[PDB]
Design an enzyme around this catalytic site. Sequence first.
Site, PDB file in Angstrom:
ATOM      1  N   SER A  50       0.818  -1.203   0.000  1.00 12.42           N
ATOM      2  CA  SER A  50       0.000   0.000   0.000  1.00 12.42           C
ATOM      3  C   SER A  50       0.868   1.276   0.000  1.00 12.42           C
ATOM      4  O   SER A  50       1.665   1.491  -0.903  1.00 12.42           O
ATOM      5  CB  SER A  50      -0.920  -0.040   1.217  1.00 12.42           C
ATOM      6  OG  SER A  50      -1.823   1.037   1.182  1.00 12.42           O
ATOM      7  N   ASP A  67      -8.802  -4.885  -6.926  1.00 10.26           N
ATOM      8  CA  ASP A  67      -8.488  -3.981  -5.829  1.00 10.26           C
ATOM      9  C   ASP A  67      -9.363  -2.756  -5.948  1.00 10.26           C
ATOM     10  O   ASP A  67      -9.210  -1.939  -6.847  1.00 10.26           O
ATOM     11  CB  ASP A  67      -7.016  -3.566  -5.848  1.00 10.26           C
ATOM     12  CG  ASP A  67      -6.588  -2.854  -4.556  1.00 10.26           C
ATOM     13  OD1 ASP A  67      -7.438  -2.164  -3.936  1.00 10.26           O
ATOM     14  OD2 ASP A  67      -5.400  -2.978  -4.155  1.00 10.26           O
ATOM     15  N   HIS A  90      -7.526  -5.371  -2.216  1.00 11.23           N
ATOM     16  CA  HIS A  90      -6.348  -4.719  -1.671  1.00 11.23           C
ATOM     17  C   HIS A  90      -5.601  -5.600  -0.655  1.00 11.23           C
ATOM     18  O   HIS A  90      -4.375  -5.479  -0.489  1.00 11.23           O
ATOM     19  CB  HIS A  90      -6.743  -3.390  -1.014  1.00 11.23           C
ATOM     20  CG  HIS A  90      -5.577  -2.515  -0.706  1.00 11.23           C
ATOM     21  ND1 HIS A  90      -4.854  -1.875  -1.690  1.00 11.23           N
ATOM     22  CD2 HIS A  90      -4.969  -2.214   0.467  1.00 11.23           C
ATOM     23  CE1 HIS A  90      -3.849  -1.219  -1.137  1.00 11.23           C
ATOM     24  NE2 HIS A  90      -3.894  -1.408   0.172  1.00 11.23           N
TER      25      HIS A  90
HETATM   26  C1  LIG Z   1      -8.482   2.969   6.593  1.00 15.54           C
HETATM   27  C2  LIG Z   1      -7.094   2.630   6.157  1.00 15.54           C
HETATM   28  N1  LIG Z   1      -6.589   1.569   6.825  1.00 15.54           N
HETATM   29  C3  LIG Z   1      -5.396   1.092   6.379  1.00 15.54           C
HETATM   30  C4  LIG Z   1      -4.636   1.652   5.360  1.00 15.54           C
HETATM   31  C5  LIG Z   1      -5.094   2.791   4.697  1.00 15.54           C
HETATM   32  C6  LIG Z   1      -4.338   3.324   3.529  1.00 15.54           C
HETATM   33  C7  LIG Z   1      -3.440   4.431   3.667  1.00 15.54           C
HETATM   34  C8  LIG Z   1      -2.747   4.896   2.486  1.00 15.54           C
HETATM   35  C9  LIG Z   1      -2.952   4.264   1.215  1.00 15.54           C
HETATM   36 CL1  LIG Z   1      -2.067   4.808  -0.139  1.00 15.54          CL
HETATM   37  C10 LIG Z   1      -3.877   3.164   1.022  1.00 15.54           C
HETATM   38  C11 LIG Z   1      -4.531   2.751   2.223  1.00 15.54           C
HETATM   39 CL2  LIG Z   1      -5.605   1.466   2.015  1.00 15.54          CL
HETATM   40  C12 LIG Z   1      -6.374   3.304   5.113  1.00 15.54           C
HETATM   41  C13 LIG Z   1      -6.928   4.600   4.575  1.00 15.54           C
HETATM   42  N2  LIG Z   1      -7.373   4.498   3.187  1.00 15.54           N
HETATM   43  C14 LIG Z   1      -3.444   0.837   5.178  1.00 15.54           C
HETATM   44  O1  LIG Z   1      -2.495   0.940   4.388  1.00 15.54           O
HETATM   45  N3  LIG Z   1      -3.529  -0.161   6.076  1.00 15.54           N
HETATM   46  C15 LIG Z   1      -2.293  -0.885   6.390  1.00 15.54           C
HETATM   47  C16 LIG Z   1      -1.582  -0.161   7.542  1.00 15.54           C
HETATM   48  O2  LIG Z   1      -2.012   0.940   7.971  1.00 15.54           O
HETATM   49  N4  LIG Z   1      -0.477  -0.835   8.010  1.00 15.54           N
HETATM   50  C17 LIG Z   1      -0.097  -2.049   7.239  1.00 15.54           C
HETATM   51  C18 LIG Z   1       0.399  -0.317   9.115  1.00 15.54           C
HETATM   52  C19 LIG Z   1      -4.743  -0.143   6.876  1.00 15.54           C
END
Ligand SMILES: Cc1nc2c(c(-c3ccc(Cl)cc3Cl)c1CN)C(=O)N(CC(=O)N(C)C)C2
Lengths: 728, 728
Positions: free
Chosen positions: A592, A670, A702
Amino acid sequence: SRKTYTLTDYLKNTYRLKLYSLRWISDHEYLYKQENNILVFNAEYGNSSVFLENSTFDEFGHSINDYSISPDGQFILLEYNYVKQWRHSYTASYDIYDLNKRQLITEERIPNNTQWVTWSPVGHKLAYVWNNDIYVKIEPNLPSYRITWTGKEDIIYNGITDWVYEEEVFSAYSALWWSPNGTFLAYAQFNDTEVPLIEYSFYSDESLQYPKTVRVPYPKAGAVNPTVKFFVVNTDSLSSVTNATSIQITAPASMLIGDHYLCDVTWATQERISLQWLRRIQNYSVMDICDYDESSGRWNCLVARQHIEMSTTGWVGRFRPSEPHFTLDGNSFYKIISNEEGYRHICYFQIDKKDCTFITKGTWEVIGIEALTSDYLYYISNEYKGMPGGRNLYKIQLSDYTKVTCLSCELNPERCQYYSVSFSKEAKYYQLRCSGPGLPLYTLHSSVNDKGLRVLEDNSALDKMLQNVQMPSKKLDFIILNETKFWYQMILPPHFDKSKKYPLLLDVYAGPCSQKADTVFRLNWATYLASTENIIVASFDGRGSGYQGDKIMHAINRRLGTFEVEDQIEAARQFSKMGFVDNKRIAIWGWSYGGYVTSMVLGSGSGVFKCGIAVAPVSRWEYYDSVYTERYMGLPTPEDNLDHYRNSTVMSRAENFKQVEYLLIHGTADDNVHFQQSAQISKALVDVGVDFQAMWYTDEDHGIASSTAHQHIYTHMSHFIKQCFSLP
Amino acid sequence: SRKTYTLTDYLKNTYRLKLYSLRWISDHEYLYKQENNILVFNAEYGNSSVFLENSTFDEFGHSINDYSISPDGQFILLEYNYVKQWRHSYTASYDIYDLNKRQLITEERIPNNTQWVTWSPVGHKLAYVWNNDIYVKIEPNLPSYRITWTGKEDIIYNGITDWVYEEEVFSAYSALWWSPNGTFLAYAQFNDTEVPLIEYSFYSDESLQYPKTVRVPYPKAGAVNPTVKFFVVNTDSLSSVTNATSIQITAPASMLIGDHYLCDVTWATQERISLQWLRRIQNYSVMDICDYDESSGRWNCLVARQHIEMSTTGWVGRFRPSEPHFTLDGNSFYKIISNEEGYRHICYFQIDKKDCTFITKGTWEVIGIEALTSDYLYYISNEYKGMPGGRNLYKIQLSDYTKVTCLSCELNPERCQYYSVSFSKEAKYYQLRCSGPGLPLYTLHSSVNDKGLRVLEDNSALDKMLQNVQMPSKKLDFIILNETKFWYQMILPPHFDKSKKYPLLLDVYAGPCSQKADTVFRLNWATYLASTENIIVASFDGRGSGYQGDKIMHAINRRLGTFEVEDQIEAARQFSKMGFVDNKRIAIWGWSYGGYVTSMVLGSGSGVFKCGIAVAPVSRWEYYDSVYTERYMGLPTPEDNLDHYRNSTVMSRAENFKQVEYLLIHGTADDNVHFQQSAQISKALVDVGVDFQAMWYTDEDHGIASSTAHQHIYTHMSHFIKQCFSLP
Ligand SMILES: Cc1nc2c(c(-c3ccc(Cl)cc3Cl)c1CN)C(=O)N(CC(=O)N(C)C)C2
Ligand SMILES: Cc1nc2c(c(-c3ccc(Cl)cc3Cl)c1CN)C(=O)N(CC(=O)N(C)C)C2
């Protein structure tokens, strides 16, 4: 010990953590399922008894997915035919079951394909959503009342979120809020009519002759947003002959002059609702305080008492405006604000007065307000020892803010440095949950003297197994750069020799308010890499990371793909300094946002990394959603921040990729970071003549999380890391 | 020393085959584009004159994609703004230039976005297609008459083919046939109303925020096909104020009882058209003879003159019923037909008589009828020396059929064994083009005594350049399976040594009526693999392969993915018994149908192959298009051939891929073999934990032939093959 933590162990769950998930049903009892029997426990004395026997539904017919019990325990909701949609949403069938009798309700059943269901806060009222429409049933065997008629798929959402809101705003499919009474039912309505669609193929079973195209309303950065309204219905006065009357509470006028979001909804009292709204440029937000006028039947939101929030340095809140926790009387609340020096602390507001009063302060931040009583407020923070990646439970005395007692710090300090908490209704008891550095530890406590009552789950079973296995250790420490401390972690192979040289993997997320350096105990891919393949696995919390104050978190405002990227590279350089890394074998990977940062790192020609893996990366910020992106990037216009949108793409670095091995992976279904983003990465790499390795996963979203795909990608990625490092 | 034929020499086209491309204008002159100067040559004596200076249109201000000079050369069409669609179809802008003056015509111009244009056979009428409707201009500066009004994007096609007719039937976007006068316009009309649409994303430039979804009416096996009607309009009697009247010619009752195709249109005389139709079950085709009634104003086809073709062993024709070549009076014609022994030969039909008479026979095949005079019929076949992979021009005296004489056989028997030809009108002269085994050679000849006139292109430049490179050589030969001959070819490294063992790449196609063992000279990827990497690239024509008669071609009938798959395997086994291949290093690969066979093979468990590559494979025959599939597989219904449709998928064989290294490649914009086919393979491999390797190409189609993609795929496949063979 002979044995290591193998890829198959991760993949197959050879070593499982036991948890202890309970649901408080009052000030002193809670439910917990033993085997598949549901027990009720007395908190003070610990005696338990069987509440619901597994056998009760052997003849139900369907496999039951989850259950929900009414506040007064008369009835129980059984959820089956669960079909997952997005990260929170899903549809399902429902049965209610009368408990005073031993009988299943057959009249006026909740409809198949229901989108959301929830009891009232007390009693046994039901509100559910179906076909984007809201229904209320006073009695579980009584015909429902229809509250809205506007519902239309992909267009009109009553009582549930459209995509951006579920994902980015409420973290929920739900958009209904009962009043504590159980008398009013508030709900939000979203209008997606003019929101563009993201369209992609889903290929389904081999038997499908033609591929389906999925169409979801999805605003990308800069595009037309969904619009929102808010309403409150008086549940008590539901007629059988009259349609039901919803009262509208319009947004503040400071909001109505342009795009905006409903970001928080909180019942303060029986007759007081708090609504927080956020301008589409998220540096400004408004909290309204709405009271029910029994005479007129309206909900009035005196302009005078709105509470306003602004940021000069960034956006508002960590991810959004913090939530208000109201005192019983409803005349005041507490809420996490960034203070004069940009550290997030607890402020105390009184409803009709100016400013607020900071009751906590220091070079560290409150993580969340957890509970409130007449004597005490309870919160989690990372004060103890100045470790921003630690969490402990504190209480401060309301009558004298200088009396802050820590409830969890000294409990067992070598094993636990990261707690979350769950308070029973009215805060008579709490369950502490420690997540690390040692094995997870679940304990009960009583509030009066903060005596520990008993151990709920000490994970002893897991412990005896891992003694047999050759487990990595975890180093949490920090480097200094300009004069800021920056925290990292290394997951180190067993029997670590700092005189030897190891391949290193930089495991990145590094997105805004992220933290990848903590004290949490994990069993995951990294454990495998370290235990079996003797690879070090590092994370570094650079600029943009969270829980260390706005100076660091906001350093990235309007400027994504810069300092957070630069800092990861710099950390790899510090890691080489420390003379136990093979500067020749450094790799990097992220999912991500981590995939975006990883790609940028690999396209900067730094020379530091040999190869890396990016999974479902952002590649260009115009492709990701409005709410998340604009929060940090503003709008993609010439008059706002288009210059840095254009200038922070992966594609524009393609030339540099010929200096590295790169593996790029994405699920085709995704719905979140669209296959598009990597579809563009590869084209740019192709157009410039750089060889690279790739893998798509057909129909995975995703999370690429289906069991077969999940085993497959970590198996594929493991191969790629082994080859890169020359590992047997 | 000498240097070697590298990956780059191929990719960058370092060594170029020159051609001599001409088009005959008359019985004695031809047109020839040279350095963008258009020249007229006199065949007899060789003298030329410049028809149009390369300097003209320096003033045009558009790039000019192509030209087209009216039959009676008063005008020339300038095609610009060309934009490709499918394999034949495209859209473009036009201008007319009046040669008999000096100026471009300014008024009544041909519209932008025109889909097809053509002159009539004589003079300079014009027929064109715009927004799916047919238009006719009697004079270039005059306003067009509108012929049809039914045209509708994606639904009604007047005068142009839809996707399946373009691709599988007419091999052309055009569905217009002028009569010889120029008097009649005949055209087809297609209705894709109920034909299902394949949908897929197109991502475009980085600047596109939301991916586009393309949608093409495209019938997959078993699904609803377009339907077709045929019309003839009279160009002479077009009323400027009355909608022109079109005359419909109806398909024969034996076609109207069910789904059928119109599969051939040929003008016999000024007043006689031949139409061939083909049942959707391609067992049965009917040639209709239609005469213009001078009083009726209508067209009649007497069932009596019908000619019916039935194959009980397979389908009719090599890919479709063969083209009829009419004698000058239109009362008789010649046609290639499979004889009793299943070999394809020239047959002679007289109009009002029942059967036909074979002009040739023997255990070889006629490839095509090329020219017909009153004295001689000229044809290409593979009789010479009994090599099916060779092509030669023959002429057969029509007053005595025993008097067959060969025209290109002994010209240069060393250099040239594969000929194609091109006659002037009335066949006074002919250009011969040989393509192997030596460098291509272009020659001109007079037909009175088959005297050679001159060399047009001998490729001396290429010859000179290759003296400096270690070219690989090409063995052509056969082996015996079950008492029959089956041909293969071998590209052998320079300084081939039968004492050493070489790794072997098997290059496969093997679709019905294919041929990969032939005598033509190619400069391609195999050439690089053999020259630089010292790899043998072999190809084999097993069962199902063509030009050898029906016992072999039709063996595959209704059982695709069987005998042609077993046989590619058995050929590889035979190739090990030849003591110069390393049977520990045998690869296989193929594009398209070749991809399907390569996949079926890598999944068969033979254990014979170490690894293979599949590029844009078919995986399941219900995914490919009706006309091609049902030709060989019948209908995918339980009454017809359902079972073997499902017994022939790649996905069923997923398990066996764990025994092999497999690379799977496909463009995401493949309108032809849809990316779906490959996405299902990878999902099969993933559901059973088989690791493998992938690469998609963003927005590339079946060709993957954009310059940068082209270079990337072959660079990528080259790494894969090399690492698999452990080559330095
Ligand atoms: C609600 C939300 N929750 C998460 C992420 C993102 C997110 C943030 C930036 C991008 Cl570019 C894409 C997503 Cl889906 C978002 C908000 N859309 C994400 O990445 N996750 C992994 C994480 O937070 N970890 C593995 C620590 C969990
Ligand atoms: C009209 C046509 N032309 C071509 C092919 C196919 C074809 C046949 C089977 C399948 Cl599954 C897919 C296609 Cl596109 C078809 C008809 N669709 C093909 O493949 N080509 C490669 C070739 O001429 N070779 C490699 C010798 C050229």
